[PDB]
Amino acid sequence: PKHEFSVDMTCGGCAEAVSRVLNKLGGVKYDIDLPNKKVCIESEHSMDTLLATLKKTGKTVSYLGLEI
Template sequence: MSSTEDHTYKFNVKMTCGGCSGAVERVLKKLEGVSSYEVSLEKQSAEVHSSTLDYETVLQKIKNTGKAVLSGEADGVGMGV
């Protein structure tokens, strides 16, 4: 497997308002190695694409916002949170 392969990480994040989703967006925007991301308050989700970051690194950054991560997956495979 090539290390330049793009990975997709999806997280179910408990967000109650625009400020919550904004906090998650800010950490993802600052995170080096993220090629793209989408945060949805409506779907309570954050989807992150990266070829250099591992799942645990992205998970920890989202958790650092203080938001509860309810579930996560990496490339379609359920992962622990």
């Protein structure tokens, strides 16, 4: 599916950090929108896997829902 999340990305460094955590996890296609502090993910991973993955940044995350 394509899962929309909210992530507290303050700057380009933080957006890049989100890129890398998703990268490590793998099996994801993503579009991080820095000004709107959102990240859209196409994947077969669990919302919960995706959520845990994004929270490893230390930033505030939440699942908004399907985009889709």
